[PDB]
Every structure is written in structure tokens, then in C-alpha cells.
Design a protein around this ligand. Structure first.
Ligand SMILES: [Mg+2]
Ligand SMILES: [Mg+2]
Ligand SMILES: [Mg+2]
Ligand SMILES: [Mg+2]
Ligand SMILES: [Mg+2]
Ligand SMILES: [Mg+2]
Ligand SMILES: [Mg+2]
Ligand SMILES: [Mg+2]
Ligand SMILES: [Mg+2]
Ligand SMILES: [Mg+2]
Lengths: 185, 141, 75, 105, 62, 144
RNA sequence: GAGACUCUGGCAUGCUAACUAGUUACGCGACCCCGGUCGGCGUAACUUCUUAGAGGGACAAGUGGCGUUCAGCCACCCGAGAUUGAGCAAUAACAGGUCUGUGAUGCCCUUAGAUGUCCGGGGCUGCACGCGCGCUACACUGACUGGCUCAGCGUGUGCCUACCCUACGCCGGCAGGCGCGGGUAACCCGUUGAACCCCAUUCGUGAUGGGGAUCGGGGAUUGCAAUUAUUCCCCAUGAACGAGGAAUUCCCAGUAAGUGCGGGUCAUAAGCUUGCGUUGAUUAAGUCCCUGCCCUUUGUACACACCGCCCGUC
RNA sequence: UCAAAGUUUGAGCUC
């Protein structure tokens, strides 16, 4: 597929970013996509080099945790590969649209700090980073000690996260932080 | 045509084990049933006619690089003696099973002790390598 | 705290239930069938390899660690 | 081509430039040093260089610039080298950076 | 109380234990006219967008 | 295989020893006393067995075949170095020694060490670390 | 003192050059459908590759704001390099440690009816109890079982000194046994025949093949001699541990973290200790809140210095 | 626009 591309079996145009809030700063379109999350690296070198890192890579980065899996990127990549295919299979939406719904719901728009702490709405790099870390910890906890594979559980997790069921640990943290903040803000 | 590098190795070993059984002239050892693949290994090989699978691998390493003696095949064929609580080390294969795999292939004319030492792959061996290469190539094709 | 007491072999009625329902899931992994019907993942793999033998399911990606099969493409 | 898990990494530049440039060539790649992935990400950049050098060297240079610019417009790692290399463990500790474990109690 | 997006026009200053929370002047991209102050945790740059569920709150600058 | 087998034994008996059907045949048979995972594995190589089968699948006759080979290893072609009774105490004839035979042989190991009054018999009674451990630093759950 | 320096990495298809390094031009041979392959063979020069001496090489070189338009910052551009990485490392401490390396050693004491010394043996490993450095875990992103694959650290027969690296064919699961060779080494070890990776099974969410502590019986080797198991080997019992509470170790780039590989020592050969490769992130470009640190000011009844000084009843 | 933060062998510092 050298001249015109069909990325495997995926259309370039016709993938709408629904939420207006994160549209520029999710630099997810027309160029940032690559065949794998995995890439040589250097993505955490400078400040916004992290920003220019692909968001699928940031899912890979979050997935590898609990010791035995540190620096096994191809394996946790394969996880993201088969889970995204699966998300696409079961829900019937473009996996990054379901994921953008993950970024939208799971990103905490504010956090608290010592200015007794007061809440303030956060910058986009941490707020996306936080959403990815959260739903990764959710997928791991759900899939641990179960026959079901991590990649298939990870697909199911992105589905239920975009849905917003309140069953994700990430949503449990978001609801706890928000209501405590209302009481003491 | 095709060669070992051209082949996917997993179904390569299954085709070659069938190929060597079809020949039915390896003279398989008596102890193939009793033996365990390394003092550091726990169970016997998953393939039932495993001695044939390592005869394939050892021959194909001698193709890859000739002159591979017993100790040579064990170094290439070495690995983690996962020592549990103690730290891990490099562990050679078993001698009796390795030496007999090499002696089995020396018997049936697959491998040959070249002058000035070491094995080279014999006319019959390079024949069998590219034929089973074409057979497996046809399978994956 | 939690434990999985899974069944080693299908009953005949369950065999009819498999022949009916399992090819309807979009995800067919031995683990998927294991969580839903409380059955072992290994015999699960053999069951999906059996729907392969009888000729009921198309493979997407099987691999030593993790396999995935499905009912063949729907359309 | 084993490892087959890292093949799309190998085709990214091939897909980027297309088959028309590479069609006239056939290229074997010899590899050494590093490890398997390091060497894989190496031969990735290598063949793309060799082809740019082929058109820059034995034919007219407009082909070299057009190939090279399409490459620059897609991704800079293809040109900016990874200087990254594996850091050695240091004496005075159990790990790489730590100096020896201070132990109260 | 609807949602409001706002662009960082000007980093004012960092407050916080680590000088970690930028009090920032923002222009609303819906109503280009309006603009507000407030502090923010996490890495901030002049010119980036927040989705505030409220624009009425405001952080005490030091 | 998928239909439930006939006379499915949720527990087998061997040497007055119960065998679990959940485990895979090679490791499930090791539930038997006087045979372990490899020695059991050896009897299975000597036997005509597709070890990819499960331990609930195989019949009571198969466990009895493995067991008779285990009990009379000399009679059923098991090596001397593979045995869990190397150089047997009573007669010095290679046969396999079992659970009750095992407990009796245990009584005999204690009788030998105590009667001669050997230090290591003393170390069995005292309960100390023979392997070069500090007992200064071990054995707490038992000792209070 | 930092810096500088010395060494390393990198730019040198340039100088000087090599049968213990290869090279580019061809041809043959067996086979596969002319060629392709081969550490099967032949045709010379040369140093592109290789090896390492001399030299040479990049510097804020370009720009914007800001600034005495100074020093230069930040950002961006420009580039194979716009910090490669070490070694060394100021003044001054602790009354933390070293007479336990030695005929290192001061002072005091001792020396034949000896507190010397020699021979053999012991504790250091002696165990109701506790901690710190460490090791192993709680599994399926994984384990069990085969096959496949690039390295970097390395070594090798010793003055006395017992043990070399090792190619090539046979014997035991393992410890280990029989023929000839190369090498004192770019010649022989050695293409430094690593793991990971990659493929199909098998396992199946289980105190599980997770975890391998403890130990019975036996077979080997290391050693004069191991009971406080010398080590390796063979079969077995199989604690807690279902991902870490208050606590606390570790980290900004090839870093943290996974994973093996080697060395000193070295009879068994890395459990000490110190390296070697291999896969490879997050976050911050911010601040001194915590923790420490560095300066200025400030108060002080401390100055063997808050681990301080200091007050009264009984 | 202020709830709190105690001690430290007798076994030898010093021109
Ligand atoms: Mg290997
Ligand atoms: Mg300096
Ligand atoms: Mg002295
Ligand atoms: Mg003596
Ligand atoms: Mg799982
Ligand atoms: Mg175990
Ligand atoms: Mg056991
Ligand atoms: Mg005053
Ligand atoms: Mg008070
Ligand atoms: Mg005191």
C-alpha cells in the first residue's frame, strides 16, 4: 500500500473527535498514528517530546506494571494490538473514538494541592497521562487471576470506560475526589 | 528453492519428525523413553518422538554452522537453569541424549565427520534439507 | 477470597448448548468460554480446537501464550 | 522474517516511501553489534539510507532530496540518530544508580 | 452551570509548595471576549486549554 | 472425551492413597505414595500413554498398570538410578517400597540412628539445622 | 577547587601502513529453477572494510526578542556531533571505624616451674528470641515442553606451586571415562556458538507445574580433614505468600525496571563481591512545601555548640 | 487571618 494507504483495513479520513475540549492537544490524527505503539523511543526526553509521543504508545507505557512485565514492550504492545482489534469487534466503533471517550471521562479535569488543599483544573499533559494510567490500573486489576486474557479484558475495559459505568477503579477515584472536593472546596 | 531460513521452524520440526519416521532408519536409542532432556529440565520433551526433533535441530545447526561437536551443540543449546531462590546460570544440555542424537544422525547418513575434525552435512543431508524445505514450504504456501 | 471451581467435561445437554450458542459470541477464546460456563481454560482450548475440527470457528490469532478464535466473519 | 513481532516497525519507512523507489533495488543487509532489537531498529534506518545514497550517488540528486524530504516530513528519528546506549551498573550499590544502601537500625 | 473551555494566554505565576500551580489568565475560545484568572496543578504552558466545569472559582495568588 | 466418561472416578485409590482427577495425568498420578513426578513420568514413558489426556479420562486399570510397574520396577523395566528406593535395607533386591513400607522404613531409620547413638540421629531428635544454617536464626513457628 | 588536564566515544574512504587482517575483479565444481549457495579450489595488487601510530576535526556556527545591544538567557532554526562518558576531586569534620593484612606499630606488660611456640582439635556455623543488607513468591502481559537467535565482559599449561585453553570420534540423567590434534595464542580456545526475541503445543486462575525454604534415604565429585549438611547429583514431603497497612529503598533517557552473561577470588566454582551484554518507560524544564542543602538578614542566657542550656516541689 | 514538636553512658571535650 505505497501510494494510497488503507492502513491495514482502516480509513484515514472519517474519524471524528467528538469532544471539543481536547481536540488540538490530542494530537492523534493524520500523522501521529503509526503501525505499532512501539517506537524507537526518546519520547520522554524533552518536555513536549512527551507530547509528540503517540497516544497508543502512552497506553503501552501505562500497561507494563507489576515488576515481571517491566521492559516487555512487544508483549504489552501485542496486548494493545489484540485488545484494540477486540474493542473494534465488540462495540463497533473506531477504537480511538472509544478511547477518546476514555480520555474524556477518565481524565481528571481538576486535582487538589497545597496553596488543607484546594482544587484547581489541570493542564492537558498530566490530565491525559492520568487518564491513561488510571484505566490501565483498572484493566490489570480486573484481568488478574482469571482465564480471560489481558488483551481481551483490556478491550472490555476500554469499552466499559468509554461507557462510564462507575465500575472502573478510575471512576471510583474520580467520584471520590470530586465529591470530597465539593465538600471541602 | 527453499531452505531452513525460508521455513517457519515450528512446523518444520513436525514435518521433519514425520519425514525421519517415514525413513524409519535412524536407529533410535533404547533409552529414549526413560531419558529427561537435561538434568536441569523437569519433564520429558513434549514431542513423543522427541529424539527425532533434536536430531533435526542438531543437524540443522550443523548446516547453519558445521563442525558443531557435542559440547558445541550444548553451548548453542544452553539456557537458564532457573535456580529458584539461588541466582540463575548457564546450563548445558544433557550429554547422553545429545551425544546419542549426534551419533544417531552419524549413523543414518545425515551428518559426517569431516577430515580435520567436526561435522559437515553430507550429500544425502543437504538433499533431505532442501526436499523437506520444499515440503514445508508447500505447507506454509 | 474468590475461587473458580470449573467443570472438566461438558454434559450432553451442555453439548447442545455449545452447538447452539458458542458460535454466536464475537469473542471465542478458551478463557471466554471458561469464565462464562465455569470450565477449564485448557479443555476450553481443546473445545475451540474442536469447533475447528468439526469446522465451526475461524482462527484470528492463536499463539503459545494467548489464542483468539471467533465465529467466522459475520457478513 | 523473525522476529515477526517487529515487522511493521520494519515496513513503516517502506510504506512511507512506497514501492516505486525501492522497486529498482534488491538489498541484502548485514547486521552486527548491539542486540536483536537494537540491530532491528538499525537495519530499519540502514536500508533507507542505502537507497537515498543510491539515488544521490549513482543517479541525479533530485531523487535523493525528494525521498529524503518525504522522510523528514514524516518522522525525524529516521535522521536524528538514537545515541542511546545501555548504562553500566556502578560499584558502591546493589543496582545501577544507587550508592550503597544506607541502613538505619 | 455549563462547561467552559479556556486557552492560556499568560502564565502569571507559580504558587504551590513547589511553585507548582500556575495562576493563569485565559481567553475563552467560545466567547473570545471573556477572560479569567485561576491557578492550575500539573505542567502548565502559556496557551493550553482547560475544560472548567465552573469559571467562577479563583485561586489566591501569592 | 467431551461427553463425561463412564465410571468417572472423582477419587481413585492407590496404595491406600487417593488420586485427584483434576490434575493432568502425569502430575495427577503422582498423588500416589512412593512415586513422584518424574518417576511417575518414567512409568508413563514405559507405558503406552498420550499424556496430553487428562487424569479423569484414564481408567483405574491404567493407574493399576502404572502402579504394578512402580511396585516391581525390576520386573517392569525401571532403572536402578531412577528409583526412590536405591539400595533397599531389608533384602537388597530392587522392588519399590511404599507408603506403609515407607513409614516402616522410617521407623527403621530411627531405630538405626538411635541404637548406634549417632550424632545425626541426635540431630533428628533435637531438630537442628544440619545444612549449615544458623539455628540461632530459624525454626520459629514450632518453637513458640 | 570548578573548569582546565589525561583517557574513552565520535569527523576524518585523508598521512603512515599489514599471509597471525582481509580486499575487489573473475572463473570453475555438486545440485536447484545462465546464474544462486559453499568456513570446496585458483588468478594479483591494494588498504574501501580491519588493526593503530602520527597529524588534523566544532566553534554558540545562524537568527529573533532581552541586555550598556555588553556578558549572554530562553526559544527556534542551522547541523553527523550545539553537554559522549569517566578518572581525579577544595578547606574542614565524626573523637562512627581500622594494633583483625604483615617483622604496619607506639607505650605498658610477658618469656623456661613460660601468658612464647609446635602438633591435633574447637568457636566463628553452638539457639526459646529480633533486626538490617539479601534470595524467593503470590501467576496466563504468565508458567510448563520442544525449535529458532545478535553480543559484550572474558580465559588459557604459573620461579617456588600441585590445577591450562581446548579442536576432532566413543561412555553415565548427573559427578565423571577411552582415541588423536591446534594453541604459550589475531594462528588453537573462538564466527567470543548468552539469554531475550520469534513459532506451535501444553497448562488454566488453583496455595497452581505459582513459591522452593526445610529434610529422610542414596549416588558422585571438591578436600589431609566438614558433625555447623564440601560440592554436584537422584526420588520425595512442600510453610506463609491471592500484588503489599503506618513505614521506607530506587529513578528524567537508553535512565528507572525486566533478563540473562562473565571476572577477582577460583580444589567443587559465585551463595561474597564486582562487572558484562540484552529489552526498554512514566513523569518534570518547575520549585524549594516535605527532606536536605546553599547564601543574606535577624535574635540568642548555647560555644565539649538543641543530642543545648536551664527552672521548682518532693 | 496560628490546637502540638519532650528526653538522651557514670565509662574521659581541651592549650
Ligand atoms: Mg540458545
Ligand atoms: Mg576540572
Ligand atoms: Mg601489626
Ligand atoms: Mg596439629
Ligand atoms: Mg490471565
Ligand atoms: Mg514447586
Ligand atoms: Mg516435592
Ligand atoms: Mg536583645
Ligand atoms: Mg502548645
Ligand atoms: Mg546517660
Amino acid at each position: 500500500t505505497p501510494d494510497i494507504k488503507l492502513f491495514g483495513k482502516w480509513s484515514t479520513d472519517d474519524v471524528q473527535i467528538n469532544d471539543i475540549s481536547l481536540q488540538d492537544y490530542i494530537a492523534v490524527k493524520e500523522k501521529y498514528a503509526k503501525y505499532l505503539p512501539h517506537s524507537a523511543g526518546r519520547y520522554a526526553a524533552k518536555r513536549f517530546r512527551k507530547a509528540q509521543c503517540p497516544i497508543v504508545e502512552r497506553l503501552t507505557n501505562s500497561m507494563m506494571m507489576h515488576g515481571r512485565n517491566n521492559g516487555k514492550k512487544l508483549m504489552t504492545v501485542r496486548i494493545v494490538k489484540h485488545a484494540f482489534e477486540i474493542i473494534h469487534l465488540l462495540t463497533g466503533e473506531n477504537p480511538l473514538q472509544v478511547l477518546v471517550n476514555a480520555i474524556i471521562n477518565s481524565g481528571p479535569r481538576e486535582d487538589s494541592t497545597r496553596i488543607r488543599r484546594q482544587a484547581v483544573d489541570v493542564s492537558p499533559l498530566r490530565r491525559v497521562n492520568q487518564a491513561i494510567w488510571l484505566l490501565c490500573t483498572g484493566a490489570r486489576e480486573a484481568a488478574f487471576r482469571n482465564i480471560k486474557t489481558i488483551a481481551e479484558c483490556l478491550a472490555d475495559e476500554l469499552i466499559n470506560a468509554a461507557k462510564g459505568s462507575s465500575n472502573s477503579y478510575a471512576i471510583k477515584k474520580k467520584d471520590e475526589l470530586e465529591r470530597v472536593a465539593k465538600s471541602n472546596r | 528453492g527453499v531452505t531452513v531460513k525460508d521455513v517457519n521452524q515450528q512446523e518444520f520440526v513436525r514435518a521433519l519428525a514425520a519425514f525421519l519416521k517415514k525413513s524409519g532408519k535412524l536407529k533410535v536409542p533404547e533409552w529414549v523413553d526413560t531419558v529427561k532432556l537435561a538434568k536441569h529440565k523437569e519433564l520429558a520433551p513434549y514431542d513423543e518422538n522427541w529424539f527425532y526433533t533434536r536430531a533435526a535441530s542438531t543437524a540443522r545447526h550443523l548446516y547453519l554452522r558445521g563442525g558443531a561437536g557435542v559440547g558445541s551443540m550444548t553451548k548453542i543449546y544452553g539456557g537458564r537453569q532457573r535456580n529458584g531462590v539461588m541466582p540463575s546460570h548457564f546450563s548445558r544440555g544433557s550429554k547422553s541424549v545429545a551425544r546419542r542424537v549426534l551419533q544417531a544422525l552419524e549413523g543414518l547418513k545425515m551428518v559426517e565427520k569431516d577430515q580435520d575434525g567436526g561435522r559437515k552435512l553430507t550429500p544425502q543431508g543437504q538433499r533431505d534439507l532442501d526436499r523437506i524445505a520444499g515440503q514445508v514450504a508447500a505447507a506454509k504456501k | 477470597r474468590d475461587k473458580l471451581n470449573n467443570l472438566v467435561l461438558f454434559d450432553k445437554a451442555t453439548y447442545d448448548k455449545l452447538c447452539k450458542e458458542v458460535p454466536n459470541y464475537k469473542l471465542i477464546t478458551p478463557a471466554v468460554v471458561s469464565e462464562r460456563l465455569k470450565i477449564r481454560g485448557s479443555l476450553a482450548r481443546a473445545a475451540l480446537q474442536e469447533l475447528l475440527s468439526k469446522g465451526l470457528i475461524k482462527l484470528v490469532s492463536k499463539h503459545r501464550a494467548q489464542v483468539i478464535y471467533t465465529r467466522n466473519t459475520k457478513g | 522474517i523473525e522476529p515477526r513481532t517487529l515487522q511493521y516497525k520494519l515496513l513503516e519507512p517502506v510504506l512511507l516511501l512506497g514501492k516505486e523507489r525501492f522497486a529498482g533495488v534488491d538489498i541484502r543487509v548485514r547486521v552486527k553489534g548491539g542486540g536483536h532489537v537494537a540491530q532491528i531498529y538499525a537495519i530499519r534506518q540502514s536500508i533507507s539510507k542505502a537507497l537515498v545514497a543510491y539515488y544521490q550517488k549513482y543517479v541525479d540528486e533530485a531523487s535523493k532530496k525528494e525521498i529524503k524530504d518525504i522522510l523528514i516530513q514524516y518522522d525525524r528519528t529516521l535522521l536524528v540518530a538514537d545515541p542511546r546506549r545501555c548504562e553500566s551498573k556502578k560499584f558502591g550499590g546493589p543496582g545501577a544508580r544507587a550508592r550503597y544502601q544506607k541502613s538505619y537500625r | 452551570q455549563p462547561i467552559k473551555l479556556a486557552r492560556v494566554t499568560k502564565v502569571l505565576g507559580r504558587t504551590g509548595s513547589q511553585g507548582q500551580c500556575t495562576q493563569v489568565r485565559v481567553e475563552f475560545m467560545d466567547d473570545t471576549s471573556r477572560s479569567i484568572i485561576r491557578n492550575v496543578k500539573g505542567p502548565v504552558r502559556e496557551g493550553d486549554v482547560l475544560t472548567l466545569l465552573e469559571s467562577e472559582r479563583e485561586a489566591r495568588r501569592l | 472425551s467431551l461427553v463425561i466418561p463412564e465410571k468417572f472416578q472423582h477419587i481413585l485409590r492407590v496404595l491406600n492413597t487417593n488420586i485427584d482427577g483434576r490434575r493432568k495425568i502425569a502430575f495427577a498420578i503422582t498423588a500416589i505414595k512412593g512415586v513422584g513426578r518424574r518417576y511417575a513420568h518414567v512409568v508413563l514413558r514405559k507405558a503406552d500413554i498420550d499424556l496430553t489426556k487428562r487424569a479423569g479420562e484414564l481408567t483405574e486399570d491404567e493407574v493399576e498398570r502404572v502402579i504394578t510397574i512402580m511396585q516391581n520396577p525390576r520386573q517392569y523395566k525401571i532403572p536402578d538410578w531412577f528409583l526412590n528406593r536405591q539400595k533397599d535395607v531389608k533384602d537388597g533386591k530392587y522392588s519399590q517400597v511404599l507408603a506403609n513400607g515407607l513409614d516402616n522404613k522410617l521407623r527403621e531409620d530411627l531405630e538405626r540412628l538411635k541404637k548406634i547413638r549417632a550424632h545425626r540421629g541426635l540431630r533428628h531428635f533435637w531438630g537442628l539445622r544440619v545444612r549449615g544454617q544458623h539455628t540461632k536464626t530459624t525454626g520459629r513457628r514450632g518453637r513458640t
